[PDB]
Design a protein around this ligand. Sequence first.
Ligand SMILES: [Zn+2]
Length: 258
Amino acid sequence: HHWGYGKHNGPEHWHKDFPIAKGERQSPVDIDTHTAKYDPSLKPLSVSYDQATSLRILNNGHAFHVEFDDSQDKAVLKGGPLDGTYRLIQFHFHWGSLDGQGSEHTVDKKKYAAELHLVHWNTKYGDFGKAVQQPDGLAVLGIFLKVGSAKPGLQKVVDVLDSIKTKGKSADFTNFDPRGLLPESLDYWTYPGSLTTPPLLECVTWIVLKEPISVSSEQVLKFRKLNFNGEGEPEELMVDNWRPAQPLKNRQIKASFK
Ligand SMILES: [Zn+2]
């Protein structure tokens, strides 16, 4: 028995094992576009993914993660509200059982079909493990997905999902370019928050892009064929692996655009 997204172990139950779930800077949150403050001092984001080296894709029972080689500054995020260099370690998604839900963050209460999270850690801390224990340890880039036209750059990911259907399965996933998942504009909102899955540590500087990317119904449908369970167990479809919006509390959301 452990945390999950079911009726008996879902987000509403997480606080029992992870008290920080009721903390002061929990994520996700609803982004009120009219209350967000334009900050002229916010620098443009600098995304350098030209040398990215993907290694593997795996189903960890909560979602599927694409892992990268983070032993050198191959794929990094700089600028914006960040101080220093952050290395990309993995990316994963959050999606729903229907196109009307799936994203973790919401914009003026609007929910998207899914949300992509590109996780980076502050190189000043040496490794991911040390970084999650710091208030400025991680930088997660959040991108919304809406259903419409297909996204060619996402197809390589959808085609390998069959090989990692159940919890615990992993497969080689080399030469994947994450640049094909980015929208045209890099305008964003930013706030101090946390990881949206246990341990729910409050070590993240969220950077949520304003422009969503479009994916086809067929592409998101394949996400929904994954399983929460491991092989040889009752099939439980991996859907609605998202945490509901949390109280903003004493926090301000800043925007890089007016
Ligand atoms: Zn996530």
